[PDB]
Structure 1
Amino acid sequence: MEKYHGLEKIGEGTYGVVYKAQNNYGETFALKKIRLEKEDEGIPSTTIREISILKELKHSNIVKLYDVIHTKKRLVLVFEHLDQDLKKLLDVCEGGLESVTAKSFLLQLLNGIAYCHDRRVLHRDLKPQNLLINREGELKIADFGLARAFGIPVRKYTHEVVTLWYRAPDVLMGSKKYSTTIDIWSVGCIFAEMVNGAPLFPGVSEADQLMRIFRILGTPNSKNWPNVTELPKYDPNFTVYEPLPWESFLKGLDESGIDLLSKMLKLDPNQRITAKQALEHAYFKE
């Protein structure tokens, strides 16, 4: 294909396997084989087009897309290559990341998200595994925009489970709206995880996920979430929980850090801080 050789499996993304490869310039790339919704139904032309426009996303914290290779029921995406990801790093660490590093990862993640959100490009699947990191501690987000083009599939058991951990309450309760707020919730979860060394809400199912959330942040109500009642899977019979003190589940974060984090994990999507507002927070000036 396109003259690439030396493939080498290097992981398994949410849409297929990822390989490290080289072209005929010696230069390295990451090749993602897209395994999609209906594989036997071919790849619609609108999909090809939607993906190819993602080539305009050019920013220091977004994994660059170089080429879209479409061959007889075989879609391959050629991406910038990075040798490490945040999940792998969190896995080996005990107690999380040092504050200075957490901050730098947080800053760079926000910058990437902000650049995309300004162009109406959503992720809808942010998680540690999609945050790629190079030698120099630079962070690049992978997979922005693929959910819109490919749709979000129900992944292999072990993957769907990890995915729940970063899913906003409104989404778990049946919302299907287009929103930038979905990504900000994921950042909050990622933020908490860098400080604690473990996922903040590790549920095993949607329902379990929602309860783990409410058990820590409080159950929704008229004051904290007007119109939550409009969500399809909302239930007024939710066992009531009062919110826990931020300090109790955020290991000596820091004052400004807790505040910023509290703005990300607002249950009401409409009150959730944006990426660009987050970048203005005193946390990053300290």
Structure 2
Amino acid sequence: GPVPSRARVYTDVNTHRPREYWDYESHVVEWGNQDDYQLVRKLGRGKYSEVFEAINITNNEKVVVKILKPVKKKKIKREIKILENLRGGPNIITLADIVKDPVSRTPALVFEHVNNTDFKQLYQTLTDYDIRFYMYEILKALDYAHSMGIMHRDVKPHNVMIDHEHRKLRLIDWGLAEFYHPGQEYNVRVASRYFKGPELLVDYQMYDYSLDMWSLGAMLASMIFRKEPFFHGHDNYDQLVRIAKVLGTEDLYDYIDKYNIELDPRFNDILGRHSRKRWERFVHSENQHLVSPEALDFLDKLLRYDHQSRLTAREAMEHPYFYTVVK
């Protein structure tokens, strides 16, 4: 069977907590007043929820209301408990309220509002300095979450809200987040295709916070190389092949052999043999202003097959890429 794995940081944080911290099934939802909120505009529908722009008629503050769909069930209390555990943390979206929607009869999570610009438009305008700046902001959120025993599991541009006017960033949509418990086996069917770490793509269930560090690297690669998405697979299988065409097959085999993981045999006809590519291969006149030796080295240390070998969020924050960022 597979060789086990543990996080190399924040390994045992949940074990020292009161049971109530991580045993979200027992949580008792505090409810506020639904009549405080007036829906203004439907913004999106996700797999699990309908999102609205709303107004809190009390203090006239704009808010976001996510009306949760009767999904698997227990994810309601997981998301609520994680949001309450992380509330107040750096760059973590604030859960302002929980109300019972009278139409859906389901919980509606009320969040602080962030004035965001569609990442498809925004990323085209980020300067080198801005990429560094906002990456550092994301890292603050991830390190906080990880330090609190939580992995986000769905880091992607759509879940990073940026008010670019005010240089304000929030990491949102904690509905796939989980508590990290050493030795626990998790569902690999998390995250969006283009941001899934190799551990998910090879069906390795004993993963950890380092999953989010891969996702962050996939975001960074798309930003500095102006290639959206960077790893552009047609499905979850081709997704791995797209990674292997960059990182090479030999290191992929070393990774699965380390954990005594066997690839799905359907890779035999599609994976092929690929060398590791030098990152320079992706640099060209249109992205060159976003690339630097520091950016490439940082990226290289995030995008590793072996989840144990990737930089942690705190290690990332130490990297030379961020020396130019004022703090």
The TM-score, its normalising length taken from structure 2, stands at 0.74
Q: Which amino acid aligns with 1:81?
A: H
- Among 114, 137, 141, the alignment partner of 1:82 is 114
Give per-residue Cα distances to partners, 1:122-158, cap 9 Å, x unaligned: 1111100000011312111002364339x98979xxx
Residue 62, structure 1, aligned to residue 92, structure 2: yes
What residue number does 1:141 align with?
A: 171
What residue number does 1:259 align with?
A: 297
Distance in 2 between the 1:93 and 1:53 partners? 29
Q: Name the structure, 1 or 2, with higher relative contact order (CA <8 Å, separation 6+).
A: 2
- Which deviates the most, 122-131 or 138-147? 138-147
Unaligned runs of 5+ in 1: none
8 Å Cα contact 1:37-1:153 kept in structure 2: no
After superposition, residues 72-151 of structure 1 pair within 5 angstroms as 73-85=105-117, 88-91=118-121, 94=124, 97-134=126-163, 135-144=165-174, 146-148=176-178
8 Å Cα contact 1:263-1:272 kept in structure 2: yes
What residue number does 1:3 align with?
A: 36
The TM-score, its normalising length taken from structure 1, stands at 0.84
Identify if the C-alpha distance between structure 1 residues 73 and 148 changes in structure 2 by more than 3 Å, giving closer, same or farther: farther
8 Å Cα contact 1:220-1:267 kept in structure 2: no
Q: Secondary structure at the match of 1:11?
A: strand
Q: Which amino acid aligns with 1:84?
A: N
What residue number does 1:201 align with?
A: 231
Identify if the C-alpha distance between structure 1 residues 69 and 148 changes in structure 2 by more than 3 Å, giving closer, same or farther: farther
* Residues paired across the two proteins, number: 271
- Among 165, 189, 201, the alignment partner of 2:218 is 189
Q: Which amino acid aligns with 1:35?
A: K
Identify if the C-alpha distance between structure 1 residues 148 and 246 changes in structure 2 by more than 3 Å, giving closer, same or farther: same
Give per-residue Cα distances to partners, 1:254-285, cap 9 Å, x unaligned: 01110010000011111111110000011101
After superposition, residues 217-236 of structure 1 pair within 5 angstroms as 217-221=247-251, 224-225=254-255, 227=257, 230-231=260-261, 233-235=263-265
Identify if the C-alpha distance between structure 1 residues 206 and 176 changes in structure 2 by more than 3 Å, giving closer, same or farther: same
Q: Secondary structure at the match of 2:244?
A: helix
What residue number does 2:310 align with?
A: 272
Q: Which amino acid aligns with 1:33?
A: I
Q: Which amino acid aligns with 1:264?
A: L
How many Å apart are 1:14 and its aligned residue? 4.2
After superposition, residues 23-42 of structure 1 pair within 5 angstroms as 23=56, 24-38=58-72
Distance in 1 between the 2:242 and 2:252 partners? 20
8 Å Cα contact 1:168-1:186 kept in structure 2: yes
Q: Secondary structure at the match of 1:225?
A: helix
Q: Which has the greater radius of gyration?
A: 2
Identify if the C-alpha distance between structure 1 residues 188 and 245 changes in structure 2 by more than 3 Å, giving closer, same or farther: same
Unaligned runs of 5+ in 2: 1-33, 180-185
Identify if the C-alpha distance between structure 1 residues 112 and 204 changes in structure 2 by more than 3 Å, giving closer, same or farther: same
Q: Which amino acid aligns with 1:183?
A: D
Distance in 1 between the 2:90 and 2:207 partners? 25
Identity over aligned pairs, percent: 29
Identify if the C-alpha distance between structure 1 residues 93 and 281 changes in structure 2 by more than 3 Å, giving closer, same or farther: closer
Identify if the C-alpha distance between structure 1 residues 69 and 178 changes in structure 2 by more than 3 Å, giving closer, same or farther: farther
How many Å apart are 1:213 and its aligned residue? 0.5
How many Å apart are 1:234 and its aligned residue? 4.6
Q: Secondary structure at the match of 2:300?
A: helix
Q: Which amino acid aligns with 1:77?
A: L
- Which deviates the most, 16-25 or 213-222? 213-222
Distance in 1 between the 2:154 and 2:308 partners? 19
Identify if the C-alpha distance between structure 1 residues 267 and 152 changes in structure 2 by more than 3 Å, giving closer, same or farther: closer
- Which deviates the most, 50-59 or 223-232? 223-232
Aligned CA-pair RMSD = 2.8
Distance in 2 between the 1:83 and 1:21 partners? 13
Identify if the C-alpha distance between structure 1 residues 263 and 271 changes in structure 2 by more than 3 Å, giving closer, same or farther: same
